């Protein structure tokens, strides 16, 4: 209900220690009113089952949702002392179900950034993290985190190497661990040469070759430095629940190479 | 102080005019009469209080013009008076002499000189008068003089017997309370605030355990306030007499009435709490105002029609029915309402509902033409005595009904109308249908029952009657088939060598029945039959595995054949063989006794006598279905509450006694029992409640859980002691059995690592401070010390044992990367080995393996480490600066964790395989899969726990493949942010038990052969830090679980390694016995 | 042939015997004196002649086909036995007086059961003698324990008090079963009662006085085989039906007839112990039932009872 105030109820959460949760931040000085009306319209679609209608509590500029003690998802606007630039904050527990809830939410937020702010892409994406429960959190610009995603290593503290973090906790939607089990790319089965002889065609995201994934000829879409990672999952969203004989089936994704494996015949 | 108040009781029948008599002299009209202040209670109407809750003078009043008939009507009143206060004074006053010819005066005079003034059974009438009218009289002047002088004489009589006069001194504080209770203005005068009122008046009679009970006792006897002591509205609800009497009497007058309609009216009359309303109805029963019929109805005995409804009975010939008569001189007041209350529960099927009818003076139950029952009053001409007639049809069900009726009648009289026990019991019979009945006393039939003969007509031998048809309750024909005595099985001699014991009931002999050892109780000429049947009533309907059952009864020699215990009394065992008394046996005994108590308490039976002498053992074999039983259900070992001799027994008294039994079991020496030999200290000790620590005082091996149970059980306050149901639930626990010790560490001490010495003490690290501090725990004395031994914080400890060289050392790896090595036999022998290039993350040791934070593994030669500054045999580079080694396991091939890889080593320390485990992210969740390995357990598969994971991975080391996942959250999800589900440590037992600690205070026990949850051990502490398997100095294997208990408290818990087995075995044990309980109860 | 034969109003019969060659001798229970009445089933005729001072308790037919004569023996309350020739009613003979009243008779030789538990045995042709002494006398019971059931079904089963006797060819007590042990089953008031009727085939069927059940005993092991609950069967039927057993009759095809004190007669299959059927409202109270063969050779049941104005009724029931 849009008639509600921006009240933020004192709700005790499970997963109170820093490592127990995931925190995602979106910075921008102001998100013009109507933004949150469109946001909640998209937020009231979240459902991890798709890959239950819990005691959600709409906060006008965000929502509680609740879900379960095991998995929950808080989304809403924030502002800090001496930090007038407002921001969105997402809190889910550090687990796969939380990752799923997060993944759907961040796609809904970006869908809104394309809708409410068409062409604006301000909207700075930060991964909030700490190396020890109870400590102060630090922020990683996701662009730099993606530079590290290419490395594939842990976040390593250069001053104190003893402190490292398994990057997927920092950003659960970076690495596709929240996919339907049947489409997680088996990297030991993707016989993908990437030679010109395997070309089928191309596209704005890169080019299309083919491979012998699990012994079967499949089409492969390479997101060749044209907004990879992002476009890849956005396509996966379209592919999710897409089921018809006349359509090209998804035969596992592949966030590590940024290469989708599709039905070829 | 010299209390000068006395009650005056004015009684008589309706119509006497005795109220006006009082007015001239000066439910119930209560008022003071200062003369000596008399508390006058005028029972003008039928206020049952004189029987429903019975220092007083009894003024009896009757109307002389009615005459001798009225005199006889007063006999029930006199009976009741004697029956409750035979020592009290009685003044008999006849009235309305101005309309009564002296003929009647002298007729009644002679009537009382012949039948009351010199007649035993009546409370020795002290004096009497005749009065013309209540307008005043010289007779009344004399009466006033009589009452005064006689009340003085009465108190003199009390001094002669009781020890108290009319100025008897009573504690002044009780007197004060009387005044305090007088000064009470409450709308609904039900009092609980009395506790505060005690505190208002400073605090007098401060012995709440003794003086308070005496004050209350006094307050009811003195007529100040009313306790109602098993009602809920009893102890904490002191109620103004005026309301009690007024409201209940009025509601009677405001005959079957639905409860709900009564509730409707009552709610408008006086807005009582519904809780109080439920008690209100219970009080109506208690005070004989109204009796419960169905759950929705009340009988309301008073006002029931007194014109016995026309009842046509089936059966007419003499031989078709059985008749029993009870001859009485008069029925006691309330006799019938009490009798009815009992008879309403009769049923021939208890081993469709009946068409019940009520006469006020009788009950008719119908059920079926096959079995029905009529009980009611009848009177014959020329026979002043009144009497009961019981009629049932002559068949087995009819017999069963008869038995229930006569048992209730006799029980009624024993409890409420003693003195009669007059009650001439007659049986009716005839030798030919169509003729008249003949009377015979049951005593004579008992004489014939002993012969076993037929009743024979002494004049005509051709006419005989089987005794059973006349009196099927003399011969036990109403027994369940299951307990009829088979005379071809029972084999006994009654010879001296078989005598097991005796008592007021007769004697007990050892015998054989159906090839089994049994005990036979013989009612050898001790008011038998009645005692026999009382025991039969109690024994039947109690069918629990922990009680001694009845193995058939038989009237022919009047016997009860019961189970005989084979191992004898607990008492003997305690003083005979401690070797039999193992920890396992002890626990099982405690369970069996607790069940019996729970059962009997649910049956509303207070045992009142637990002790080692009453516990019987049927086999010392620890793993048996039934081991202990409670004897004879239905000294200096008393609760301190009941030990006062001024309260009433209840379940809490039994619980307290149980606690003492448990204490006695705990200390197998029976040390408090040995204390009995000096009873002057023993009985007082229990009264004091100041029992010594069972461990420290007697040298008894620790048994926490039980120790606190005893403390919880033996509390001074009955309302704080545990219920017997709860006691059982507590005893029902595997944790109870297997927890052996619990040692708390000093406040704000944090231990991050442990090394037990395999030979009885533990070396402890210390992560509380930021300094290398080494602590030490002595398990033999629970001693504790600690000293700083290094600069940076100690991370890992390891024991180097050189039995060949006869020495051992503690290796302390720390944050600085140094290795401090200290001789366990000499604290002065401290030295440091070659410093590592990074901190030490784990140690294992023969070679001393040092896993460092930079992924480097140093291998030191076995004895070499003795030397200061010694270098390692060789060094391996396994991981890197960001991938520390964190686990070296071995169960001669090594396995271990490095970052996300599992490595393995040969005896040459070469790498035999680097298994990347990150690939497991195809299953589960990538942030769990991609995380540093904490521990590796090596069995027939590898069990991997990673940092902050809730999932344990199972790997097939033979093919290097993921073979399963263990979801810890799931297990605790089934259990109804302490539930983090984070895996802390893994320990493995070769009997398939897998021990998993976690973030919260939970330990999961899993079955390695099926990957299933055996049990969740929990509410342990705040969080589990480490778990170790270690053999104690007595060669016992235990789990050493060190945890946090944030107030940073921490502690060491020691568990018996067989916990997994105890969980399953205990569960089985309990279930088997549960089934047996139903088996027994169902047979009946 | 279900012939509803009625006697004069207030005629009461305490004993009977049918001539097995078509007529029935009936004892005049409605009188105060031993009178012997006689029913002619061929003409439905009925007469009577006085035979003794005390009442007749039991009638029996003595027949000597080799002598071409027959007699009705009247065992009376006096203990005397009057023998009356049927070919000549004036040709009467007297047997030696018993020590107590005669409760039952069975006739080769005549067995005489008495109230004091004695069994007198009179040799067949002593029936022609007056003041005749018995062949042999057995001491079975006593004054408190009467002998009442003489059931040959070639040995004699004896119902005496609560015990069952079996007598040999020379009157030796072959067996003795005290049935008081049956109290473990049924109900003591029933168990402990004098035995009235004993029926034997493969087992013994015991009707005790005022019992609603019949005990079944194993003659081969002397053990209780089971109980027949008559009042139960009447319970199954939808103080007139007390269920007290009055008489047991049994045909070789297991046809057990149980006459009760009411108007119901139970027919039960002893090969399976099952109720076959019930005769309903026969009369207000069935007294006795005699299996008999008519002049037409028809197998009938002489059901004798009352329709209480006491109305004696004999139905020649079609078996």
Curated annotation (Swiss-Prot), chain A:
Q: How does it assemble?
A: Homodimer. Homotetramer; when activated by GTP-bound RAB29. Interacts with PRKN, PRDX3, and TPCN2. Interacts with VPS35. Interacts (via N-terminus) with RAB29; this interaction is direct and stimulates kinase activity. Interacts (via ROC domain) with SEC16A. Interacts with APP; interaction promotes phosphorylation of 'Thr-743' of APP. Interacts with MAPT. Interacts with RAB8A, RAB10, and RAB12. Interacts (via N-terminus) with RAB32.
Q: Which residues bind ATP?
A: 200, 202-203, 206, 208, 219, 221, 262-263, 265
Disease per UniProt entry: Parkinson disease 8: A slowly progressive neurodegenerative disorder characterized by bradykinesia, rigidity, resting tremor, postural instability, neuronal loss in the substantia nigra, and the presence of neurofibrillary MAPT (tau)-positive and Lewy bodies in some patients.
What's the protein here called?
Answer: Leucine-rich repeat serine/threonine-protein kinase 2
Copy the domain comment: The seven-bladed WD repeat region is critical for synaptic vesicle trafficking and mediates interaction with multiple vesicle-associated presynaptic proteins. It also mediates homodimerization and regulates kinase activity.
Q: In which tissues is it expressed?
A: Expressed in pyramidal neurons in all cortical laminae of the visual cortex, in neurons of the substantia nigra pars compacta and caudate putamen (at protein level). Expressed in neutrophils (at protein level). Expressed in the brain. Expressed throughout the adult brain, but at a lower level than in heart and liver. Also expressed in placenta, lung, skeletal muscle, kidney and pancreas. In the brain, expressed in the cerebellum, cerebral cortex, medulla, spinal cord occipital pole, frontal lobe, temporal lobe and putamen. Expression is particularly high in brain dopaminoceptive areas.
Tell me what the record says results from residue 184 to T: In PARK8; uncertain significance
**Location of the protein in the cell:** Cytoplasmic vesicle; Perikaryon; Golgi apparatus membrane; Cell projection, Axon
Provide the function of this protein: Serine/threonine-protein kinase which phosphorylates a broad range of proteins involved in multiple processes such as neuronal plasticity, innate immunity, autophagy, and vesicle trafficking. Is a key regulator of RAB GTPases by regulating the GTP/GDP exchange and interaction partners of RABs through phosphorylation. Phosphorylates RAB3A, RAB3B, RAB3C, RAB3D, RAB5A, RAB5B, RAB5C, RAB8A, RAB8B, RAB10, RAB12, RAB29, RAB35, and RAB43. Regulates the RAB3IP-catalyzed GDP/GTP exchange for RAB8A through the phosphorylation of 'Thr-72' on RAB8A.
The family note in this entry says: Belongs to the protein kinase superfamily. TKL Ser/Thr protein kinase family.
Query: In the record, which residues are listed under signal peptide?
Result: none
Query: What does the entry report about post-translational modification of this chain?
Result: Ubiquitinated by TRIM1; undergoes 'Lys-48'-linked polyubiquitination leading to proteasomal degradation.
């Amino acid at each position: 209900p849009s008639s509600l105030s921006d009240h933020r109820p004192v709700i005790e959460l499970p997963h109170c220690e820093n490592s127990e949760i995931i925190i995602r931040l979106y910075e921008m000085p102001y998100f013009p009113m109507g933004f949150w009306s469109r946001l909640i319209n998209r937020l009231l679609e979240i459902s991890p089952y798709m890959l239950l209608r819990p005691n959600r509590m709409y906060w006008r500029q965000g929502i509680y949702l609740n879900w379960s003690p095991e998995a929950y998802c808080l989304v809403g606007s924030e502002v800090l002392d001496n930090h007038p630039e407002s921001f969105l904050k997402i809190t889910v527990p550090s687990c796969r179900k939380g990752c799923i809830l997060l993944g759907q939410v961040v796609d809904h937020i970006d869908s809104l950034m394309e809708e409410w702010f068409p062409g604006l892409l301000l909207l700075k994406k930060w991964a909030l993290y700490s190396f020890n429960d109870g400590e102060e959190h630090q922020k990683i610009l996701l662009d730099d985190l993606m530079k590290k995603a290419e490395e594939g290593d842990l976040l390593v503290n250069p001053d104190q190497p003893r402190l490292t973090i398994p990057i997927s906790q920092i950003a659960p939607d970076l690495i596709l661990a929240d996919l339907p089990r049947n489409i997680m790319l088996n990297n030991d089965e993707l016989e993908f040469e990437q030679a010109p002889e395997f070309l089928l065609g191309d596209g704005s995201f890169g080019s299309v070759y083919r491979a012998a994934y699990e012994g079967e000829e499949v089409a492969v879409k390479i997101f060749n430095k044209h907004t990879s990672l992002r476009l890849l999952r956005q396509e996966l969203v379209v592919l999710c629940h897409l089921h018809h004989p006349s359509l090209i089936s998804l035969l596992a994704a592949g966030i590590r190479p940024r290469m989708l494996v599709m039905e070829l015949a | 102080v010299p209390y000068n108040r006395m009650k005056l009781m004015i009684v008589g029948n309706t119509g006497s005019g005795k109220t006006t008599l009082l007015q001239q002299l000066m439910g119930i009209d209560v008022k003071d009469w200062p003369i000596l202040v008399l508390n006058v209670w005028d029972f003008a109407g039928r206020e049952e209080f004189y029987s429903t809750h019975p220092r007083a003078l009894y003024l009896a009043v009757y109307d002389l013009s009615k005459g001798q008939a009225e005199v006889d009507a007063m006999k029930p009143w006199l009976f009741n008076i004697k029956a409750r206060a035979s020592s009290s004074p009685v003044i008999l006053v006849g009235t309305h002499l101005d309309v009564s010819d002296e003929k009647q005066r002298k007729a009644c005079m002679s009537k009382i000189t012949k039948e009351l003034l010199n007649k035993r059974g009546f409370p020795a009438i002290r004096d009497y008068h005749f009065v013309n009218a209540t307008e005043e009289s010289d007779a009344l002047a004399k009466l006033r003089k009589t009452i005064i002088n006689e009340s003085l004489n009465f108190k003199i009589r009390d001094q002669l017997v009781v020890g108290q006069l009319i100025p008897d001194c009573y504690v002044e504080l009780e007197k004060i309370i009387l005044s305090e209770r007088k000064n009470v203005p409450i709308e609904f005068p039900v009092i609980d605030r009395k506790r505060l009122l005690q505190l208002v008046r400073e605090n007098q009679l401060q012995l709440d355990e003794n003086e308070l009970p005496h004050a209350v006792h006094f307050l009811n006897e003195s007529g100040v306030l009313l306790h109602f002591q098993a009602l809920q509205l009893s102890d904490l609800y002191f109620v103004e007499p005026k309301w009690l009497c007024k409201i209940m009497a009025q509601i009677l007058t405001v005959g079957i009435i639905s409860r709900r309609d009564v509730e409707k009216f009552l709610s408008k009359k006086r807005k009582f709490p519904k809780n109080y309303m439920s008690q209100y109805f219970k009080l109506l029963e208690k005070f004989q105002i109204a009796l419960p019929i169905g759950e929705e109805y009340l009988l309301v005995p008073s006002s029931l029609s007194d014109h016995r409804p026309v009842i046509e009975l089936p059966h007419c010939e003499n031989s078709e029915i059985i008749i029993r008569l009870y001859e009485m001189p008069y029925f006691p007041m309330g006799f019938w309402s009490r009798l009815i209350n009992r008879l309403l529960e009769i049923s021939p099927y208890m081993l469709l509902r009946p068409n019940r009818m009520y006469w006020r003076q009788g009950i008719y139950l119908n059920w079926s033409p096959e079995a029905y029952c009529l009980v009611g009053s009848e009177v014959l001409d020329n026979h002043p005595e009144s009497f009961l007639k019981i009629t049932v049809p002559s068949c087995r069900k009819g017999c069963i009904l008869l038995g229930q009726v006569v048992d209730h009648i006799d029980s009624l009289m024993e409890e409420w109308f003693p003195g009669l026990l007059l009650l001439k019991k007659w049986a009716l019979y005839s030798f030919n249908d169509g003729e008249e009945h003949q009377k015979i006393l049951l005593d004579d039939l008992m004489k014939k029952a002993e012969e076993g003969d037929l009743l024979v007509n002494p004049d005509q031998p051709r006419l005989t009657i089987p005794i059973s048809q006349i009196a099927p309750d003399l011969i036990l024909a109403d027994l369940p088939r299951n307990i009829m005595l088979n005379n071809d099985e029972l084999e006994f001699e009654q010879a001296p060598e078989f005598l097991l014991g005796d008592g007021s009931f007769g004697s007990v002999y050892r015998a054989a029945y159906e090839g089994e050892e049994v005990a036979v109780k013989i009612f050898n000429k001790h008011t038998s039959l009645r005692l026999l049947r009382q025991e039969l009533v109690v024994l039947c309907h109690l069918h629990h595995p922990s009680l001694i059952s009845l193995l058939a009864a038989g009237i022919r020699p009047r016997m009860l054949v019961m189970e005989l215990a084979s191992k004898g009394s607990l008492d003997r065992l305690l003083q005979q063989d401690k070797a039999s008394l193992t920890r396992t046996l002890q626990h099982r005994i405690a369970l069996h006794v607790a069940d019996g108590l729970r059962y009997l308490h649910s049956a509303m039976i207070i045992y009142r006598d637990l002790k080692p002498h009453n516990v019987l053992l049927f086999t010392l074999y620890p793993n048996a279905a039934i081991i202990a039983k409670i004897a004879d259900y239905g000294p200096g070992f008393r609760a301190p509450e009941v030990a006062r001799g001024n309260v009433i027994y209840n379940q809490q008294a039994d619980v307290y006694s149980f606690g003492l039994l448990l204490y006695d079991i705990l200390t197998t020496g029976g040390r408090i029992v040995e204390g009995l030999k000096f009873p002057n200290e023993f009985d007082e000790l229990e009264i004091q409640g100041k029992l010594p620590d069972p461990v420290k005082e007697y040298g008894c091996a620790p048994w926490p859980m039980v120790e606190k149970l005893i403390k919880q059980c033996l509390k001074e306050n009955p309302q704080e002691r545990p219920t017997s149901a709860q006691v059982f639930d507590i005893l029902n626990s595997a944790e109870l059995v297997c927890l052996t010790r619990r040692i708390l560490l000093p406040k704000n001490v944090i231990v991050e690592c442990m090394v037990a010495t395999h030979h009885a003490s533990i070396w402890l690290g210390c992560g509380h401070t930021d300094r290398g501090q080494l602590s030490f725990l002595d398990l033999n004395t629970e001693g504790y010390t600690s000293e700083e031994v290094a600069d940076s914080r100690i991370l890992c400890l390891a024991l180097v044992h050189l039995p060949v060289e006869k020495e051992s050392w503690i290796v302390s790896g720390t944050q600085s990367g140094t290795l401090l090595v200290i001789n366990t036999e000499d604290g002065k022998k401290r030295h440091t080995l070659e410093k590592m290039t990074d901190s030490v993350t784990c140690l294992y040791c023969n070679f001393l393996l040092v896993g460092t934070a930079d992924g480097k593994l140093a291998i030191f030669e076995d004895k070499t480490v003795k030397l200061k500054g010694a270098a390692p045999l060789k060094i391996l580079n396994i991981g890197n600066v960001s991938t520390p080694l964190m686990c070296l396991s071995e169960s001669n091939v090594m396995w271990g964790g490095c970052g996300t890889k599992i490595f393995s080593f040969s005896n040459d320390f070469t790498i035999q395989k680097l298994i990347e485990t990150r690939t497991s992210q195809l299953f589960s969740y990538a942030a769990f899969s991609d995380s540093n390995i904490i521990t590796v357990v090596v069995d027939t598969a590898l069990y991997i726990a990673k940092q902050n994971s809730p999932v344990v991975e199972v790997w097939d080391k033979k093919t290097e493949k993921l073979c399963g996942l263990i979801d810890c959250v799931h297990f605790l999800r089934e259990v109804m942010m302490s539930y983090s589900g984070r895996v802390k440590t893994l320990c493995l037992q070769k009997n398939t038990a897998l021990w998993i600690g976690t973030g919260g205070g939970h330990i999961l026990l899993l079955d390695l052969s099926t990957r299933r949850l055996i049990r969740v051990i929990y509410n342990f502490c705040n969080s589990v830090r480490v778990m170790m398997t270690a053999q104690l100095g007595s060669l016992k294997n235990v789990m050493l679980v060190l945890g946090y208990n944030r107030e940073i408290q921490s502690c060491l818990t020691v568990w018996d390694i067989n916990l997994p087995h105890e969980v399953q075995n205990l569960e089985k044990h309990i279930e088997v016995r549960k089934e047996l309980a139903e088996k027994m109860r169902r047979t009946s | 042939l279900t012939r509803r034969i009625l006697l004069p109003k207030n005629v009461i019969v305490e004993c009977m015997v049918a001539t097995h060659h078509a007529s029935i001798w009936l004892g005049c229970g409605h009188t105060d004196r031993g009178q012997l009445s006689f029913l002619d089933l061929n003409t439905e005729g009925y007469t009577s002649e006085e035979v003794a001072d005390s009442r007749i308790l039991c009638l029996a037919l003595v027949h000597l086909p080799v002598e071409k004569e027959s007699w009705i023996v009247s065992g009376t309350q006096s203990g005397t036995l009057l023998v009356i020739n049927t070919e000549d009613g004036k040709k009467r003979h007297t047997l030696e007086k018993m020590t107590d009243s005669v409760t039952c008779l069975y006739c080769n030789f005549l067995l005489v059961g008495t109230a004091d538990g004695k069994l007198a045995i009179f040799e067949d042709k002593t029936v022609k003698l007056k003041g005749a002494a018995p062949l042999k006398i057995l001491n079975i019971g006593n004054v408190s324990t009467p002998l009442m059931c003489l059931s040959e079904s070639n040995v004699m089963w004896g119902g005496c008090g609560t015990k069952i006797f079996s007598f040999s060819n020379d009157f030796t007590i072959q067996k003795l079963i005290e049935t008081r042990t049956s109290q473990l089953f049924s109900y003591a008031a029933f168990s402990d009662s004098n035995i009235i009727t004993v029926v034997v085939d493969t087992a013994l069927y015991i009707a005790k006085q005022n019992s609603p059940v019949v005990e079944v005993w194993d003659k081969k092991t002397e053990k209780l085989c089971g109980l027949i609950d008559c009042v139960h069967f009447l319970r199954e039927v939808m103080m007139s039906y007390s269920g007290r057993v009055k008489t047991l009759c049994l045909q070789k095809n297991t046809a057990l007839w149980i006459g009760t004190g009411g108007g119901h007669i139970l027919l039960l299959d002893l090969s399976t112990r099952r109720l076959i059927r019930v005769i309903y409202n026969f009369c207000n109270s069935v007294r006795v039932m005699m299996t008999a063969q008519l002049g037409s050779l028809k197998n009938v049941m002489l059901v004798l009872g009352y329709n209480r104005e006491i109305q004696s009724c004999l139905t020649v029931w079609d078996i």
